[PDB]
């Protein structure tokens with residue numbers, strides 16, 4: 001799914017970039033045609049700001065999906081790094097207690113040096 | 116001054132006075148009902164100067180919106196909320212802006228609206244009439260009712276209140292001085308950039324050179340940007356002085 | 372280029388208008404300020420560097436004579452070294468804009484006469500001067516001087 005969501009989001013991203021650049025050019029040309037002395041049709045000018053925030057929403061969806069997938073894959077890598085379910089819970093409480101022991105040993109003796 | 120009446124109907128009153136009479140007797144909250152009764156074939160321009168008036172009309176609309184959004188709160192607009200005459204003037208300018216927008220839609224101010232089925236000019240005119248009827252009373256001093264307060268609390272939701280430049284950027288010595296203490300100065304040492312008269316946004320570091328008024332401090336660019344499309348009725352007022360009265364004084368460019 | 376061209380065409384079409392940055396402001400600042408929030412919260416020292424780094428053999432000092440505190444500068448050096456013999460003081464004329472050009476050795480042929488040994492010093496020194504690369508320093512001149520004195524000691528004995 002996250003790879004396929006990423007493949008979904010890429011052409012939408014290119015579409016939003018195209019519309020953003022073209023709409024920026026349209027709005028700038030309209031504002032220069034008002035600012036300099038020029039006639040110009042009012043028309044369906046299609047505001048710029050919506051395109052800009054739409055692009056930002058697409059980038060948020062992309063970074064969300066990739067951060068999720070990266071956390072999941074790093075999670076699986078360290079999980080493989082470390083068959084009855086009570087045996088699982090026994091080694092899990094063993095690992096948690098052992099890491100707690102290392103941490104409190106370091107903290108207590110780094111405080112035992114001074115203060 | 117710009118509206119030249121093409122024919123004299125109801126004579127002995129110039130169209131400034133006809134407009135002020137009509138806007139002061141018609142207290143309708145809608146802008147259409149005021150605009151109907153105002154002989155709108157008289158309010159015609161050549162659609163060139165009418166387009167070039169865009170920045171002054173932009174300042175009018177933005178100041179009205181800033182004032183009405185400032186109502187729920189001492190700030191840069193606190194005096195205008197209780198002055199009936201200035202609010203009447205703002206009403207009259209909104210009505211002539213509506214007429215000129217119907218003639219040519221490019222002259223109008225723009226509001227970034229957080230909706231697309233909106234008539235922003237009519238909204239601001241409704242709130243302005245409801246504020247002004249407070250103060251156009253005889254011997255009134257009517258504090259504004261809560262309906263106006265909540266409607267003007269809704270204005271940042273409906274439109275974006277932009278920002279405004281306020282003219283006296285104070286570098287005068289008289290505020291800085293004190294009795295019994297003399298300032299010791301060096302010559303040439305000198306102990307969001309707009310043109311305040313033609314409301315043009317200069318850049319961060321402006322490329323065209325400028326004059327500064329010596330009393331208020333307003334900045335204008337020195338030569339006009341478009342010599343063809345220039346509302347000379349507005350630009351030629353401030354050739355020799357500022358509006359406050361002080362002289363112009365050329366400011367040197369930065370070159371950063 | 373691709374996917375960005377119409378912006379480039381609009382902006383390159385509309386350069387040299389005095390209301391340009393007004394147009395950019397009006398079309399771009401409300402979107403950005405809505406999304407991104409409001410904006411932001413005597414002697415040239417090259418010669419002092421050379422003289423400060425010289426070997427204590429040389430004893431470089433300014434000439435009491437000659438123009439001072441002006442374009443070019445003038446030096447009278449010395450030589451102290453038990454191995455080397457006492458020799459005529461040597462006169463240097465360093466131009467202003469000293470790097471990117473070569474200083475000049477003020478020649479005094481008359482004091483390099485009246486001995487065979489000083490004649491050998493002078494001949495060998497003019498030889499190494501012709502051998503020098505262009506835009507050399509002062510220290511290149513002083514070191515060719517010391518090497519010339521050493522060769523004229525060895526060639527003599």
Ligand SMILES: [Zn+2]
Nearest residue numbers: 328331357359
């Ligand atoms: Zn002034």
